[PDB]
Design a protein around this ligand. Structure first.
Ligand code: CA
Length: 279
């Protein structure tokens, strides 16, 4: 399949070179997989989701996304126009309030929630969780991310936006999950992207067009934007049968575009998510 004039990030994930605008992907498009977006929620009614999105949990007085960030991330995972995995099932878990803030205890409960909740969902091709959030190092937050992964969910987490070593952030610093840095359309490390040995992969993170609340669309930037590219990619590869939740991060690193990014600090992986799709 080919989607012309796609957001640059989608084109990038299916290309061996920057500077192209068509997204190429197998038509299976993550059908039969599920991706949890653990965030400010998802505006499931957005036409872009086509009835494939649903709020399944909130820790606040509403499950609505009153911010937009969660809806943006979900859009990058699996919206029809802006998504990597255009046929995945999207489940929203609102651990962040409408200001985009959340206590670590709530974030933890949301991760443990998903580890159980997948047993209440139909995801024959496998389960992914996208966590575009973080804060200072917490062993408890890392452990919750580790549990979710161990439970059989491909966990993708943002490296963080501090232009700093991700070792000091959580869940970014958890070795057992997939930590995602951000790049721009010229294959530069995004100026804000964290780096470090704890990173596993990079994805498009600067000037990313996706869904927003009020049935709208928006371009924003962050490792929050890179993460769902990787989450969507995992879901897509899982429905293709190429990998599983336990090894998807390794598979993505193994099949990534290598050595192509600029301003990658010494000791950080130079790997950019790539679907290796031959149309
Ligand atoms: Ca890892």
């Amino acid at each position: 399949a080919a989607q012309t004039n796609a957001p640059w990030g989608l084109a990038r994930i299916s290309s061996t070179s920057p500077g192209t605008s068509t997204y190429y992907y197998d038509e299976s498009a993550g059908q039969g997989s599920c991706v949890y977006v653990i965030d400010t929620g998802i505006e499931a009614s957005h036409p872009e989701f086509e009835g494939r999105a649903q709020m399944v949990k909130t820790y606040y007085y509403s499950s609505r996304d009153g911010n937009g960030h969660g809806t943006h991330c979900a859009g990058t995972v699996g919206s029809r126009t802006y998504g990597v995995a255009k046929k995945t099932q999207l489940f929203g878990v609102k651990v962040l309030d409408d200001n985009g803030s959340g206590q670590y205890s709530t974030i933890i409960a949301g991760m443990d929630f998903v580890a159980s909740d997948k047993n209440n969902r139909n995801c024959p091709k496998g389960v992914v969780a996208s966590l575009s959030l973080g804060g200072g190092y917490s062993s408890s937050v890392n452990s919750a991310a580790a549990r979710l992964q161990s439970s059989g969910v491909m966990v993708a987490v943002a490296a963080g936006n501090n232009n700093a070593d991700a070792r000091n952030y959580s869940p970014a610093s958890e070795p057992s999950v997939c930590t995602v840095g951000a790049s721009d359309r010229y294959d530069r490390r995004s100026s804000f992207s964290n780096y470090g040995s704890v990173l596993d992969i990079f994805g498009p993170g600067t000037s990313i067009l996706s869904t927003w609340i009020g049935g709208s669309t928006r371009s924003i930037s962050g490792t929050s934007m890179a993460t769902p590219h990787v989450a969507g990619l995992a879901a897509y590869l899982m429905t293709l049968g190429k990998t599983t939740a336990a090894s998807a991060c390794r598979y993505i690193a193994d099949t990534a575009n290598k050595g192509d990014l600029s301003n990658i600090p010494f000791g950080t992986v130079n790997l950019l998510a790539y679907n290796n799709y031959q149309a």
